[PDB]
Motif scaffolding. Structure first.
Motif, PDB file in Angstrom:
ATOM      1  N   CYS A   1       0.725  -1.111  -0.071  1.00 21.61           N
ATOM      2  CA  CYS A   1      -0.036   0.033  -0.207  1.00 21.61           C
ATOM      3  C   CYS A   1       1.092   1.094  -0.027  1.00 21.61           C
ATOM      4  CB  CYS A   1      -0.807   0.146   1.283  1.00 21.61           C
ATOM      5  SG  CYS A   1      -1.920  -1.394   1.318  1.00 21.61           S
TER       6      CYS A   1
ATOM      7  N   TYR B   1      -2.391   5.178  -0.914  1.00 23.11           N
ATOM      8  CA  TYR B   1      -3.553   4.415  -0.484  1.00 23.11           C
ATOM      9  C   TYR B   1      -4.246   5.003   0.447  1.00 23.11           C
ATOM     10  CZ  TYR B   1      -5.737   0.099   1.242  1.00 23.11           C
ATOM     11  OH  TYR B   1      -6.494  -0.757   1.701  1.00 23.11           O
ATOM     12  N   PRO B   2      -5.784   4.783   0.297  1.00 25.08           N
ATOM     13  CA  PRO B   2      -6.541   4.308  -0.587  1.00 25.08           C
ATOM     14  C   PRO B   2      -6.953   4.994  -1.902  1.00 25.08           C
ATOM     15  CG  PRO B   2      -7.552   4.625   1.396  1.00 25.08           C
ATOM     16  CD  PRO B   2      -6.442   5.570   1.290  1.00 25.08           C
TER      17      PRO B   2
ATOM     18  N   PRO C   1      -3.460  -0.864  -4.624  1.00 28.42           N
ATOM     19  CA  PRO C   1      -2.263  -1.438  -4.104  1.00 28.42           C
ATOM     20  C   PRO C   1      -1.441  -2.242  -5.112  1.00 28.42           C
ATOM     21  CG  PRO C   1      -3.848  -2.554  -2.847  1.00 28.42           C
ATOM     22  CD  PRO C   1      -4.568  -1.516  -4.082  1.00 28.42           C
TER      23      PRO C   1
END
Lengths: 136, 73, 139
Positions: free
Chosen positions: A60, A64-65, A69
């Motif tokens: 990640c 991220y998010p 990933p």
């Protein structure tokens, strides 16, 4: 906020949320950046993958998010979208990564990868001997 | 303490254990309560397949922590 | 937009900073807050992130330590183990109270984890704590 979401995903992985067919957690419990995760999937019934355990390494990044990933299998597997040489997952081949939403998570990626093991292409495909791991 | 064990289907069961007992002994408690033999028991926790040698303290397992029990077909 | 309560609290944290605590919202996310905060922790600056979940003020704020600290109430990943945020939170408390309560823990480390050796061997263990505040919180 990246950090706090990964903290929720960590606690969920420890409480084994989901249908019990996938699991995820930190690769290093002392990693304060929460970057490197390990996932695991058990094959779905009615497929050549069924009951074979597959481990995965998941990365990640700082965005991220916001962005998806990186995902790669460590256990050998023959499946559309997975590099036959090192097990890296091509995000273009997985809809959950090709069209990534910030609502998704590591759990979702694992669940999506397991569901795709039921697809017509992957349902019947010659698998390497169980338990093998790519050269890393 | 108390720990959970979720199976491939989705069933979750509770189990009493201590933070100092080994997984080999923990694999036995799941046997006496569910009958599954330690031979075909593969316990997973947070993306890690547990090794019979180590102990729960090594995996930082606390109360309410849920295990995933995967069996060999 | 964002709920009025959050706006009111933000203007108070802006117009009345807490002594020894810098707390500012991220330009992109208004609910995200960057937080910087005798005892062996004197001198070293400690960064912190604070978040307000959608359930706020019903749910307690999310606060962890970006910087590494040797402390009985902080695990290896920096999440703060305080009751005010665990299960003793009430809507009456505000960001101000959380910050003040966190700095209180810095002043009075309560051993009531590493705490097993941090409370028993209070001399050999604290020798390491004072160092971490210089190694990992240089600037």
């Amino acid at each position: 906020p990246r950090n706090f979401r990964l903290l929720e995903e960590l606690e969920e992985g420890q409480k084994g949320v989901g249908d019990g067919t996938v699991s995820w957690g930190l690769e290093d419990d002392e990693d304060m950046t929460l970057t490197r995760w390990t996932g695991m999937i058990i094959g779905p019934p009615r497929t050549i993958y069924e009951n074979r355990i597959y481990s995965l390494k998941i990365e990640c990044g700082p965005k991220y998010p916001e962005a998806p990933p990186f995902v790669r299998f460590v256990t050998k597997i023959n499946m559309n979208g997975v590099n036959s040489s090192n097990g890296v997952v091509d995000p273009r081949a997985i809809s959950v990564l090709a069209k990534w939403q910030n609502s998704y998570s590591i759990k979702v990626v694992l669940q999506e990868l397991r569901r795709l093991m039921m697809s017509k292409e992957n349902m019947k495909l010659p698998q390497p001997p169980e338990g093998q791991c790519y050269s890393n | 303490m108390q720990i959970f064990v979720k199976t491939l289907t989705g069933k979750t069961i509770t189990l009493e254990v201590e933070p100092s007992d080994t997984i080999e002994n923990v694999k036995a408690k799941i046997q006496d309560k569910e009958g599954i033999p330690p031979d075909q028991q593969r316990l997973i926790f947070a993306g890690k397949q547990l090794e019979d040698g180590r102990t729960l303290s090594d995996y930082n397992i606390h109360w309410e922590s849920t295990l995933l029990l995967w069996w060999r077909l | 937009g964002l709920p009025r309560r959050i706006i009111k609290e933000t203007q108070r944290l802006l117009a009345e900073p807490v002594p020894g605590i810098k707390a500012e919202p991220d330009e992109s996310n208004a609910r995200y807050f960057h937080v910087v905060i005798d005892s062996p922790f004197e001198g070293g600056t400690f960064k912190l992130e604070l978040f307000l979940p959608e359930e706020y003020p019903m749910a307690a704020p999310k606060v962890r330590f970006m910087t590494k600290i040797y402390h009985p109430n902080v695990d290896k990943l920096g999440r703060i183990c305080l009751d005010i945020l665990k299960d003793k939170w009430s809507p009456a408390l505000q960001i101000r109270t959380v910050l003040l309560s966190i700095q209180a823990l810095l002043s009075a480390p309560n051993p009531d984890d590493v705490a097993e050796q941090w409370k028993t061997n209070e001399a050999q263990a604290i020798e390491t704590a004072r160092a971490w505040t210089r190694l990992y919180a240089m600037n």
